[PDB]
Amino acid sequence: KVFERCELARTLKRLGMDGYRGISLANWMCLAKWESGYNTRATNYNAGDRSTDYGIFQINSRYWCNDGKTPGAVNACHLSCSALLQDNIADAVACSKRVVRDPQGIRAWVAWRNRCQNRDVRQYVQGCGV
């Protein structure tokens, strides 16, 4: 599923993402936007370390989900990476929450640092009723 901007903002808010661990909905929107263009079936294989990024938040298999083919990987979200490719984003959100409970917080995603950190991200939620 490719979410439309406001549809996604409301979906994330309903799932309890607004201000989760001090992270605003606009930041999560900026992250999803830059990671996958709001696409839940997006995947990126990293030939360098044999890991793959999954879903709307492009969560990596080395530490967050199990795909059975990433060397010495762990599954901190205790999910099959398949769960991160569903149209329903419940599991991807549960896992993103797990990611940010770690010290790095939203900084875990390099794309967030590049295109969201210290930037005006208001535009992502404007007019969405969130």
Curated annotation (Swiss-Prot):
GO BP terms: antimicrobial humoral response; defense response to bacterium; defense response to Gram-negative bacterium; defense response to Gram-positive bacterium; inflammatory response; killing of cells of another organism
Annotated S-S bridges: 6-128, 30-116, 65-81, 77-95
Miscellaneous information on this protein: Lysozyme C is capable of both hydrolysis and transglycosylation; it also shows a slight esterase activity. It acts rapidly on both peptide-substituted and unsubstituted peptidoglycan, and slowly on chitin oligosaccharides.
Enzyme class: hydrolase
Protein encoded by which gene: LYZ
Keywords: Amyloid, Amyloidosis, Antimicrobial, Bacteriolytic enzyme, Disease variant, Disulfide bond, Glycosidase, Hydrolase, Secreted, Signal
Catalytic activity as recorded in UniProt: Hydrolysis of (1->4)-beta-linkages between N-acetylmuramic acid and N-acetyl-D-glucosamine residues in a peptidoglycan and between N-acetyl-D-glucosamine residues in chitodextrins
Oligomeric form and interacting partners: Monomer.
A Pfam family reported for this protein in Swiss-Prot or TrEMBL: Lys
PROSITE patterns in the record: GLYCOSYL_HYDROL_F22_1, GLYCOSYL_HYDROL_F22_2
InterPro entries assigned to the protein according to its UniProt record, in alphabetical order: Glyco_hydro_22, Glyco_hydro_22_CS, Glyco_hydro_22_lys, Lysozyme-like_dom_sf
Classification via SMART domains: LYZ1
Protein name per Swiss-Prot or TrEMBL: Lysozyme C
Active site: 35, 53
Biological role: Lysozymes have primarily a bacteriolytic function; those in tissues and body fluids are associated with the monocyte-macrophage system and enhance the activity of immunoagents.
Every C-type lysozyme domain range: 1-130
PANTHER family registered for this protein in UniProt: LYSOZYME C
Involvement in disease: Amyloidosis, hereditary systemic 5: A form of hereditary systemic amyloidosis, a disorder characterized by amyloid deposition in multiple tissues resulting in a wide clinical spectrum. AMYLD5 primarily affects the viscera, and the predominant clinical features are renal dysfunction of varying severity, and intra-abdominal bleeding. Inheritance is autosomal dominant.
GO MF, one example: lysozyme activity
Assigned EC number: 3.2.1.17
Protein family (similarity comment): Belongs to the glycosyl hydrolase 22 family.
Subcellular localization: Secreted
Organism: Homo sapiens
